[model samples]
Target: PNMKIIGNRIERIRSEHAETWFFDENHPYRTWAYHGSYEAPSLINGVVRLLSKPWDVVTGVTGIAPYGQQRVFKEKVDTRVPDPQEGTRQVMSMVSSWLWKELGKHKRPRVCTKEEFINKVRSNTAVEAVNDPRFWALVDKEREHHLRGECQSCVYNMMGKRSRAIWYMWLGARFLEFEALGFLNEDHWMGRENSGGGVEGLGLQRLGYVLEEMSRIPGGRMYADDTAGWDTRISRFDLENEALITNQMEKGHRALALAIIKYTYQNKVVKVLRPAEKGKTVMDIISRQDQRGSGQVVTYALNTFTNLVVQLIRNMEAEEVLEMQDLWLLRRSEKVTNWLQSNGWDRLKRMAVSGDDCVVKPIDDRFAHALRFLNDMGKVRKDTQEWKPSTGWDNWEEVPFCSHHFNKLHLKDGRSIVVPCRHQDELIGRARVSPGAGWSIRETACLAKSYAQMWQLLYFHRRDLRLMANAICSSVPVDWVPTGRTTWSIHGKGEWMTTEDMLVVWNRVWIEENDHMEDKTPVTKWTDIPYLGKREDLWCGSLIGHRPRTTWAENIKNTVNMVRRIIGDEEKYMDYLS
Candidate 1:
């Protein structure tokens, strides 16, 4: 038979040849390759066939799993070998010491002739001579004379297949999993760090930070495979387009970038084993700190899985597998369930198999949980953690602004104070408006509170308007007034305006857009309108331009006041009041 042709034949048989065989004397599928009852070719047969073929064929079939498996196998074998002479010597010494003590002053036992050795010493030693405690002990020692040397074969008999199976199943499981709506179910799907509290466990806390960061990107939640899609998404993320990277999306991207940093750091050290000297034995080489085969390792491995998922989704998008408006969910491999079933139990149980406390504690809780803890994600330790459904897409459209940093304001008196201020771009990004418009309802509301904050700072500190203007200058326009049609409405050409006029325009437009009130009275001074407060006109309104009274105004005001208090100088302000 042509070996190359035979290899191709085998491939086709395994993948494409579709034929079933019934139990009979001459069933075709019952050849060496197939043995019936969900059996494939025997491992020995597979090995022989590959060895019988070309080098590439063997390597192509064996793949990475075999390389890793062989390394582990070799290590086990190398560690098991003990010097047979040394073992025999130790056993003989132990026996001789006990025998000498029991004999006391008797002449040293010696066998000269073969007949005398067999009849006087070895004879009856099988059963009757073993009645003596000393003899029995010696016999037991003799039985284990080569035990160390033979232990390699013994352990191989015990766990070789078990270990290989675990690795194979794990690799399959990694590739097979898909996370549809993964962001919402990350703890369960990606697996969590064993938070029962240990230095090792604490080391994995960065995992949560990494995952949360990844979830903040556009389509970041989509997990079809292993790749995190941030790289792909970031390149395509229209940073300049207000419609594309809205406030919510930008916040998500920021979180995504932050998480990717953590992910990359943790992932930097991930490896199968530590580097070793040239002459070191296989057994001498140690696996890395968070080796790839265990549960804690999977925590970092999720980064890989996430990246793969993102890449797969991006490819699908490029292929038009998904429409632009359609939400992209994960597409998991169907074989994942099979792999999990085949090895999940064994993998989870391996940590505690030896019943050693040291081994049990070091392994992650998720593995243990897979063994005994409730599989239901709902059965969490805290009852308050029960899954509660809410509006799924409520915050998907826009990224909200967040601020905590302080801006330093230098004084002419050689003193400086840090003034708290909100982020301009971050807050403004949340606003909904026509494409390329200078401002939106939400942005205007942001400005309204900003205006209030600037005035409040000037009034409290008794500072000049120039100082306050300079502080707020970076956030708003350089002219501090709207231009084009907005400028025409607020101010005609060559028509100068006061700071109060800017504040009034912001507040009035904010109230109109936020409160759903019409400009019933026209061409009027700011703040001259009648009271229309229904206690619900607080928000800057949604995309539909309908104000639902969602406290947009209140949120802005609260934030402004917070900045004023956190960085405000009370003593200096009191002096100003005096």
Candidate 2:
């Protein structure tokens, strides 16, 4: 009869060909290994399929939950133990003094074999045989407290998974969950700490973790499924998973009740638990002072999940299987060590799971005292905070900037508004000019600005001229004439000469300035006036003979005064002033 490859074949394949030559040989098998060889995969396939099969039903009765959340799984030493490192004096005293006096330990012993001992016990028992009222009263009083202490420990153990599940689920509800009450038709997303406030609810940390992972990708946390062209790093799937579990769990859905209780129950410390929607989980309890938020939750969840992945990978590829492909696994395994150095929740889990001695060596007692004092004084409180949302995605739009409306497009659209004295129409309007008309209109409206340099020269002359007049005048002479005058024009050079009224004004002021000055000197002294002859006419030189020649200093002065007077009170100046 031929043997069938089912449950037993796993051992056969593991022990024979694959385990020997293929795995043992250190040399790479590139040359001899055949294409489409069925042996390696055939050997592994059935075992994988079998191990992946649901074990809940086959071992259902025997599948008692793995001591789900019992905090203490190991037996510790006491005075009465066989190897009693400490003397039994203290243990004996505690039992004899407290146990016998109050409870009257004369009850039947589960271990003792003497029938005479039981007869003697019944006589001293507090339950029924006690004769003294005082003895009965004391037994009843102490039993209540003792029973309570026992019950509290039991309750904590029982509720462990519930606490974990609720914490994770609450995190999911806060950040990842849009609306759990959508069934009531109020369909609304959670508006809690959109910025630093994601960790609002109990299980919010888990959701925050998912969001943090999503944020690492291109489009940030809001985008869904980065793999499927969401183009966003943050995926919708994580949120969907959170929402699915949150919705049903909120309704007390029991299908996942046992699994939930086992994985996350506070007391169930053996197995890693997750948020029901997805495998999201709370990695650690950061300080209670750590404000809850989406970012914090996500960060916590990422650390936890990433650590779990590191562990599972270790299990699948045992240390014995050392190869280049497995080398990658070894590299990833370093995250566990790195996390430990940071001393975060994930690090704690790494230490806890790896069974490493995690008790940090203390400094001297004085240092410990100082640390305790500083902590009590609120200094160490800083280390006890949860992840803040400030570490998460912050880019968003403001209402006013987003809602801006414009009548005309002065710039290309999509040139986003950045502020700081952005003069709109003021700039464009000022740059505008007219070819046929308002070159006069424009300069007259603003200023030709050529007047700037001339004004300084004119101002100096005017000041000296006024001083000279002041010195020369005798009692404010009734017939006093001006010695020198100053004037300027903004008009284009040609335009100034072409305008009749403008030229007339220049001639008048010139006659007045030279009028009294000519009576005093070489006439040239009053006319040349030192530096006055050096002025530019457009600025100073006159274009009379086509070969531009320096105009007479007096004549230049006259022309400047004329140009200023022609334009000063004119409509152009009036418009500029307006």
Candidate 3:
């Protein structure tokens, strides 16, 4: 902010563009006639705050819903007037002019009155105008008075195709969103620090995540599925397989649940154990946590359907099978690793099934050193805590203690309960891990986004196909089913961040700023001034403001270019803001 290069450039622009039309009676320096008079140089009434934050795009979309109520669409073509013509042309004039300009004679159009044409248009709006030949013919100056004027307005509103103008509106909206919500970061899309107060109900993060993925494509996250259309950077292949390998391996170790003891030559200690159920033990095992089902997970997943998913994981000419991250599996399977990478089923996601009835058990120690280790932990004292009073004074209450931690308690009527000892293990809580266990305190999850998107598409197409089928079933045509070049939209540009989008995003409203007010007094060495009323323009602020240029989008166009200057990305800041 304490910089001079931009300051110097601004000063230079002021000097270079010192032209006329800014003054009156030749007193150009003192009698400047603009709102920015020399005594009170005009203020910009800028945004409450200028910098963008981390999640602004959300506000951008939400912002439009409000303005849409009064927003100008081509629908009501201009009604404001100073002309003396009653029933003057609204959009009707433009259609006629265009007809005359293009066709030279303005021939073959206007069958009904202007009011009649508008009535036709009203019955069939964007949804209505589409495929309605009379509307189309009206625009071409053929069936006059059918569409009359503003026919393009109906065409523009068609939601089947994306609107370039909306893309533009979104560009400005994005700017406004930034002003209000901050920045719509890739981090914002995934991270839970959502702009809106988020719901904490069932799988809301999942819902939020998908919402972010879907909502982002119009602007920045457009690269989400970009891999040169890269959807399958390998599907859910190894998750099932690896879970199998570990399940069986752990079972193998537990069936015998055996560990041999070896003593060091100098001196070392070891313990060998026989079960409380004798040397040939009965395995009493509890599968700890949620880790029990490595096999059923595969079975459950396999038992499910995969019609849309059947080919989502497409065939690819493959290379680069493993990285160092896979070294754990490689260490256990050099043989399988060689087979997996050596031109053998490289692209096919093969199902791996491991058979195991080895039966598992618990052979962990429960007594000896557990006794010694228990004593070593600190915080040995057990302190009593009085329970807060309840309405039990006149009633007889029975108390049972299970995992009680408090030592002593006194009741309201001087009835007291005292305890001498506690199972100190309560103070020194049991470890989440079993005694001498490797890992603990964890839950696992999977991405399987394509799986989700597959189902989502199924739901979408199921609806679309039903609608399509209804029309197709009734239409008297031979080639009915989307006979054109029909398939998914370029595979994907909506889910995962395209490397380009990911890397691109890797760099870079609203607003009832209706809060506090600042008043100003313009004082100079030349003159004394008192109250300037409400100079609500900030940085020389006023509560309200407007620009000399009153055209549509001029506000956003100026803001966009100003931001472009600020960001220094010259090619273009927003594809639509201008």
Candidate 4:
């Protein structure tokens, strides 16, 4: 009853004017539009003349200005080139004007509201797939095949680390889920764990370097505005958690990381005269340049840029040799040594030569460590033959060891990744081992009640999820963005801004927005505005750093709901599926 009121007529702030809310909310144009037809022939006759697909496209477009390391394109386009900075200004103006227009903002290039600009991420939820009844059924079968049967720790790790790509997808799902929940902040994974902040852990340093390279683009006037900059910069330490997620081998995290790579410098010009090679770089994609004109640039340009970033991460001189004495790794032993060394080095030496529970002579890698583990198992468990548990309090302690097993992932896409394990018989790099862990779920009947019920609630909602994915993969409507030619000249130079280049901007070069503007009203109708504008006024060509920031307006104004009136006033979707 109390929810309907405005709550004591609170005064609005500067950024909170009514005009602001009208323009910056859920993107009305990222989806489709109905500019055609009319009452049938009124739209059909006028539209058929333009023909949907453009066959006039031929030359491949080169990424230039605002972070384009290389700016010349031998493929086409000729005229007086403006200053490199002005070229960036042109790119930025084109970008903002394009977004403002696409979003139907007021006619002209203006700043976008911070709230609407960041909320473009698709986002995710906390749905655990392992709780399914079918999950237990699968586990039951796997357990029967495994030797590490009843150990609870073994079973827990088994379910979490099983060789299934579906489970792999959930790892990234958890990342986005945690990020959305604000759980994976800088403090969570940024520096050294226990306040030794002088030097960073290996992963954080590399992320920092990449981020440093990312922020150097859009030179001169294209500064990240305070409204859009979120009061800071996009730096190397920004993506530490993202890289760590991929360490366990999830393609989900890998692809998401690459998405950021492309978003970083998609504006750079790339040449592939040497042709495609084994690894990705700026020139890794030859097929893009093989075709004439920007024909497939819309589809392949992202691949072009992300490849370079991936190569940077992959071929970053390949650091992290545990052999190196990083201050973080080196200093830990000083405190550890004093705690154990009140007497002789005998105790320190005991854990060293014999190897403690974490097992390593420091030099023994996964192969030696697991090899020694196997040797330990054969001696301890094969006492009188048939592998069984201990009984007496002092007959002798039962030493535990990994049995080491293997398995395969039956992917939903109808592909199978079969790796020979120690079970499948060690073949160089097989799936391998049970000392690792196994899912011993003989107790599922008693423990499965909560998640089993949870799974059922979403089970019935599967139809929509399936459609959501299918619709995305198949949707490719005719290209309908505006295309034209415009011109401009420098103060002293003759015709510095070219009309031919405008053709590139007026067409399809979807630069993902990365910064914000400081304008009074939000962008609402860019079409009504001039087709172009000054380079500086609209140079907010930023592409990273900011993420979705939900404001009180979006929440209280019901910006997400009220439109889903039939789905119930309670906003039932996020409750089950984000």
Candidate 5:
């Protein structure tokens, strides 16, 4: 379905036509065709090549009219009008002429229909990889249900399209996911969410900032678009139900909160790292880590920039800090020292340590401390007396008391409307015991918030943070989505344009007597009919939206059949071995 020329064309023509029809620009369509001819090749080629990969790509390409943010206007046509019959013939001839001159020069891009696209995606990289019998049995059970039509037709079929369309649409609509997970900011994250009349939770805000920064590096886009975005979206439960609560913690508190979710709140749970799974676990990946680029503009160019930071600290005035040990002290430990020497971490740390009491002022302040807390907590859980659950309940009668140090800066409670329920409480409880979220409010919430804000300012600096989030998301355990579970957020765990709208209108424009035209119809219908063109008007007026019954069944059958083929193939192979 992503050979999206028709849709892209519609958008192009709308702007082009508006120029001709309203702004007195005669035949902007002609201009549009010229522009499309120039830009279409690169974009189409990029998309086609990327689609050929095992995963979907989310990068933008060149040659499109720079009119996306521009206003449209109208214009006049040539006064010399032709006869109606002659005009129709001339228009059709001109249309083909335009196509031949532009797109025809390039090889015909692959003519994959929606089914082919689904098959390609399902077969490569998406099938289950585990060898467990229980997993295969689960697959079989689902296949059986499909055969029984439990997942087949009627109202449920629409739901299927509606549902599946949401994922693809989110994939297409990743404006914010690029902003959150990779960048260091929360501004664009907050603005987009609030402006869209949606609430942006802190977790989503942080995730969006980071994911956006991830998109800046080569191969970074997938982290936000595929890894983080897909993993979180397809998770079994609602996001709010997944615990890891937020609370305030004190600065200068040497004892780290499990460097994980160390405490429970009245309703929220905590989350931190327990351990990386031993075998075939999530974090066992050996992905491309270092960037290979030069120049200040290169998003992944860390080496030169690291050098510049070193230069800055070397040049800092002595009066800046007498106690500021020279660069030598910062470079003592290769990880800590080398980074300091390279990045002027001494000056930054001095400013951070003395100016503000926040632990993150010195980048190294919380690492060892947090690690120690995790080590201690692990020991306590292992050897010492274990905390017991109340006999009367599955867990406990009294909820964990959350420290309120960071609570003072509680400008607003993000979880006010949707407080954590029982299910989320448990997950939050798990997070508290992990090391990542274990720090007091200073280390965890305050620093996280600060980092998020810093990312937002960078977005303003770069006109957007999408490029940055793009980079960071690429390296994480799971890709992060900038948007959250809101109707309008790009990566929000919800649908855009409604399920009914995604129906393909090319399937609709059927004239009863003109049935033959259905098959041989010009791919771009309005090119033939001229006035009242494109599917929008037709769709807005038609039966709700594009409800292609055949398409619905086709999608369902493909889904069911995919599972069958995978299972059957595995069984046959195992049988052959046996």
Candidate 6:
């Protein structure tokens, strides 16, 4: 009996609203007019012209804003209709009216109250509701929240509108609770882990810097509004951390450290290169004996600028060029030490001394003398070997000692001597093995030797070192780091050799066309002593920390050549150097 009454109510409501259900301008229940012939061609004469020109084509002729003003493209004209109201009807209303008219002709008898009608409609099985067009209209409304701007506040507004409607419908408070709970369970809601008051990690620091950068662009006004000066907030916490570590150093010192971090993040100038798969570690990059941009190149622009900051501190003479207070900070701040220790400075040091991942056995017996000299300087170690485990390359214990001297050179039998030394060798530098741990000449020399030998070994195996150096040089913008004595050091060498100068030297020595002894000379025999020197005695030590710039003529030619290559119409592809 109850089911029949509900059924009758549903039928009556369907009949009552049938005229407007899918045809009304604002009808919630509407069907998609997929088959509507909104576009067609013109008919001949008046009728023929009407038939020839489709409804869409005719409607598209309508003008936009400033309709009464003089137009550049075309003059505005009005069209005639049998009924002006019908002609003025919106696309939605026209479609809705047609659907409603169709529904009126297909309904059953008996009218009912809207509440009873709604209840009967709601009582239908979920699957049956889904099959109905009215249910689809409801679904479209739900979809609007997601399809519109993806704002959290918009979602809340949508929920508020829905829950309020349900409340008035007598669905009660229980349904509202379910709606609110859905939002609470959403992912990425307040679950971020914090280190040192939620702002001290590399991740947050990077985020803050990115946000700050975005805030400077024209379209970033919204981001700036939302962040509420997040970058400045993060920087404040950075100072607090520095103070905690350095025991509240002078304002100048703290400021310098902060500046380094900010500059590195903003400029992305300095990059680190390692074995694509740890065959070796090259502290200072080395070019190959036979290639350009070859071998595995994995470049990382470091987020932390702790290394750069420390380099400035190490050079005392460089300190005078900077602001006096900043120099005091660099020299006197314990916070700088704390900052480096907290960053991955030790790991970087370890990587610098560790040398290549693989080995190249010295063929000539005199090459052993070279290796011995390097080993005595704390450059190569005979104890550690690199092996790739499932996780990654690891340091494994192995010992392979070199002979104290070339005692067998005077032997009568040439074949008796070890023609090819097959023993595995590791180039571990002094930084790892020596007891000297201070800002002294001995330590600097140890670092320098490690870099020199490591680079030589890297180059000996035909590796591409210039790719990383070039990337660093290219990515760093002009004036990112300050000029003069405080420029950061690489492998204990000051501003030594411009990028092009370095490449020129590398090409002259290694690029066969430029050199006569490609096969005749070995790396061990070459006079590469300049690389094995103190920081002050390097190539560009007199340049006052500036890289060399090419002439305007050369730059213009280079630019034109690059453009020609890009357009695929180049008369030549090789560089001028080649």
How many residue pairs clash in each candidate at the backbone level? Answer: 17, 39, 23, 29, 83, 16
Those runs of model 5 whose alpha carbons end farther than 4 Å from true positions after fitting are 1-61, 64-326, 330-494, 500-578
> All candidates' TM-scores?
0.16, 0.13, 0.13, 0.17, 0.15, 0.15
Tens digits of per-residue lDDT for model 4 on 128-241?
333335543543433332222111111000011111100111222222222221212222221222111111222211222222222232221111101111101111221221
RMSD of 4: 33.2
455-571, model 2: which lDDT tens digit per residue?
211211222222212221211111222211112111111222122332233323222232322332221122222222122211221222322122222243343333445434332
Tell me the deviation in Å of residue 173 in model 6: 60
Task: Give the root-mean-square deviation of each candidate in angstroms.
Answer: 34.7, 38.9, 38.4, 33.2, 32.9, 35.4
lDDT of 3 by residue, 1-578 (tens): 11121233223323443541122222211110111101111111011012111112324212322122112212221121122121111111222222122221222211123333345335322445534666545344411211221111111110111111121111211222122112112112112222111111212112222232223222111110101101111112212222221122233232211110000100111111112213231111010011111111122221111110111111110122222223222233343334334422221112110111000010111111111111111101122111211111111111111121112222233322222112211211110112112211111001111211221222111221122122211221111111111112222223221112211221110001101112222112111211112221111211123232122123434444453453344332223111
Most accurate candidate by lDDT: 1
Overall local distance difference test of candidate 2: 0.21
lDDT of 6 by residue, 1-578 (tens): 12221233233334544543232232111111111111111111111111111111222221110111112101111111122121111211222232223222333212122244345335324436544677545434432432331111110000011101000111211122112211111211111121111111122112222222222332101100011111111122222222121122244333432322222111111111212123432111111111011011000111011111112222111212222343222344344334334532221221111011111111112222222212111222323321111111111111111110011111121211111011111111111222223434323322323333323322221111122122222222222221112111111222222223333343333333322223423223223312211232122111112222123223434443443443244232323222
Would you list the C-alpha lDDT of every candidate in the order shown?
0.24, 0.21, 0.19, 0.19, 0.20, 0.21
Q: After superposing candidate 3 on the true structure, give the runs of residues whose Cα lies further than 4 Å from its correct spot.
A: 1-245, 249-496, 499-555, 569-574
lDDT of 1 by residue, 462-567 (tens): 2222222223322233333422111111011111223344434434432333222233233233223221122211122111122321232224333333433533
Candidate 6 lDDT for residue 450: 33
lDDT of 5: 0.20
lDDT of 4: 0.19
Candidate 1 global CA lDDT score: 0.24
Please give, for residues 247-347, the per-residue lDDT of candidate 5 as tens digits.
11232111121111111101111010111123211100000101111111111111112212222222221123211232213222233333333544233
- Which candidate number would show the highest TM-score if scored against the true structure? 4
